[PDB]
Amino acid sequence: NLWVTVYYGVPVWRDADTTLFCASDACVPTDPNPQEIPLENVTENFNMWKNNMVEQMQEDVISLWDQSLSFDPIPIHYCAPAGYAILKCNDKKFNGTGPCKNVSTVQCTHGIKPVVSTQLLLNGSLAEEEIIIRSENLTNNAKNIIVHLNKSVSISCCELNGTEWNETLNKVTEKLKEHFNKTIVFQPPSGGDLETTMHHFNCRGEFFYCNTTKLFNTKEFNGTIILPCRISGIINCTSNITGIILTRDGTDETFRPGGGNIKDNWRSELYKYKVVQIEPLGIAPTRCKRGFLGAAGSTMGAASITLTVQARQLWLPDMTVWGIKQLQARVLAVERYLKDQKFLGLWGCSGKIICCTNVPWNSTWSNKSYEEIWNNMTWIEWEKEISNYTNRIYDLLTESQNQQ
């Protein structure tokens, strides 16, 4: 009855990892005006904790520190190479993991200022609606906690205003009451060494290690409060607080400033983004034999018909020195396209995006009566279901083309 048909320009993606480009206006290409393409209906599984972006963040920023060895941290975008995509979850109650609905695609990330800090995140993008809690597992005491703020409070350094501080603490406690069912008190770390107990940052080209013990050892500021700090006859640092790092020990549960290493900082700002592989090759059953990622949530019929012939391979800069990573990405992309084109041409379906072939459709592959194939399933779901038997399908296609 039905026969296998090969589609090329298909919007289906999978999960993968790669390198990126350093959009910034060292790895310093340019950055034109970007654009964001919404998806009509895609339920996407996001996971910031497992994300591979933070590793690249840390490596590249460390290389920048070594190259420099007043920083003026430029908001640096990370641009995906050719053939890949970046997915952003726009939902406003997103715990950093799970399903997202309002999922959009963007070519280059939003600006990130790589300011190093701990126990007090400074110059970070605020929350859209309200303060929230990010954690891999609230019941695992070995994990850390990110508290994301909605109304930033400025700190001059240190000199901190207490009017907003205790209100923010009250809101934080009220929200944590939803997740943890006990009254919550705070207590300074009294940790091992300097970096895990004091507040750390840098301003105007010099480091600051400040005695931030007085901000959590609650038993009434009612005014500006001064904190000791060493390296007031110093240049001032009036950076704004965007969020805090919070940890628990072990019914007055105690929360604990401090937490993990520098990595978590970039987890507090680059959690909305995911890197995704595009795999343009699809197999479908049809009654015949002889832009991209835009409507990737539409029905099989709509996405099939919206497929038209492109005029480009698989773009921001112009006549610019690329660098090692850019050349890596471009060569890998062109090699992937060449391999895929040879694979498609092996069956003789070289020039045409859509190709019907002479292979009977073994009904045991998918069941799924023909009516529900092109009226109810998204392309990504179809690929996910057919992935069990793709290799056998490819081998049978090649064998049948060879037999003639």
């Epitope: 002889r290 409507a295 539409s298 029905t299 099939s304 018909i305 919206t306 019907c356 092109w374």
Partner: antibody, heavy 124, light 112 residues
Framework: QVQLQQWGTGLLKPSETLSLTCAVY????????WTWIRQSPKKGLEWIGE???????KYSQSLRSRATLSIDTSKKQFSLRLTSVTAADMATYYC??????????????????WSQGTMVTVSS | DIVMTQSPLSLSVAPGEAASISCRST???????????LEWYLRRPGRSPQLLIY???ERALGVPDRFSGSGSGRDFTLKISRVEAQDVGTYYC?????????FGQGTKLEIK
């Protein structure tokens, strides 16, 4: 699930312009056809027009020279404009969403998504 | 340019029984490799129509497996094995091969 809606006139006397607007509240216009069907107490169901999303249009021979079709993208509607409505052309109008399938040809499946329809009368 | 002819216009069948409708064309409704180019639709009295049969063989979502049929050339037919008091109404068959699409003359189904 997807739904359709319509807006139009009430009582219209002959020789004027009839303008009918039809809005879609579901999937975008990218991958379907939108087509108008007419039902009357006489001679049965007929065919009016077909529109893609790019703007490609197709019409019937009966009303080739009197009906035109328009679309937009900002708010996802489509529209009839029929000049010189006569007394014998009174007809309830229906919007519908043709599904399509690409196999070497635009193979046309059924028209599942049908608008609720609106009554149109003639003044005399 | 294309005219259908349905038969019968109206038949009265006892409830729960099987009935057959047949409509004729003026040209062969055969694709080069496909099945056909014909459509089958319901209409309840005073309500919007819905899809029944597309490409002459299959049925759409929510369609009970009581609607079937087939044909070729210049004759096609629809079949009901079991009819309900809910399905009293009208059936139409539609043509798509040439540009001038055209319905039929309506088939009214009424229970004894």
């Amino acid at each position: 699930q997807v739904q359709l809606q319509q807006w139009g006139t009430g009582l219209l006397k002959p020789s004027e312009t009839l303008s009918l607007t039809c809005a879609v509240y579901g999937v975008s216009l990218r991958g379907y056809y939108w087509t108008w069907i007419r039902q009357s107490p006489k001679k049965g169901l007929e065919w009016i027009g077909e529109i893609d999303e790019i703007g490609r249009t197709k019409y019937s021979q009966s009303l080739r020279s009197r009906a035109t079709l328009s679309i937009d993208t900002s708010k996802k509607q489509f529209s009839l404009r029929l000049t010189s409505v006569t007394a014998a052309d009174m007809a309830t109008y229906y919007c519908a969403r043709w599904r399509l399938m690409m196999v070497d040809e635009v193979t046309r499946h059924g028209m599942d998504v049908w608008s609720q329809g609106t009554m149109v009368t003639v003044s005399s | 340019d294309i005219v259908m002819t349905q038969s019968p216009l109206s038949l009265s069948v006892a409830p729960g029984e099987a009935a057959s409708i047949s409509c004729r064309s003026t040209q062969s409704l055969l694709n080069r490799n496909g099945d056909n180019y014909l459509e089958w639709y319901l209409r309840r009295p005073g309500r919007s129509p819905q899809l029944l049969i597309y490409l002459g063989s299959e049925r759409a979502l929510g369609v009970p497996d009581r609607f079937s049929g087939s044909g070729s050339g210049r004759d096609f037919t629809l079949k009901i094995s079991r009819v309900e008091a809910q399905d009293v109404g009208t059936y139409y068959c539609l043509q798509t091969r040439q540009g001038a699409f055209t319905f039929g003359q309506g088939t009214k189904l009424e229970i004894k």
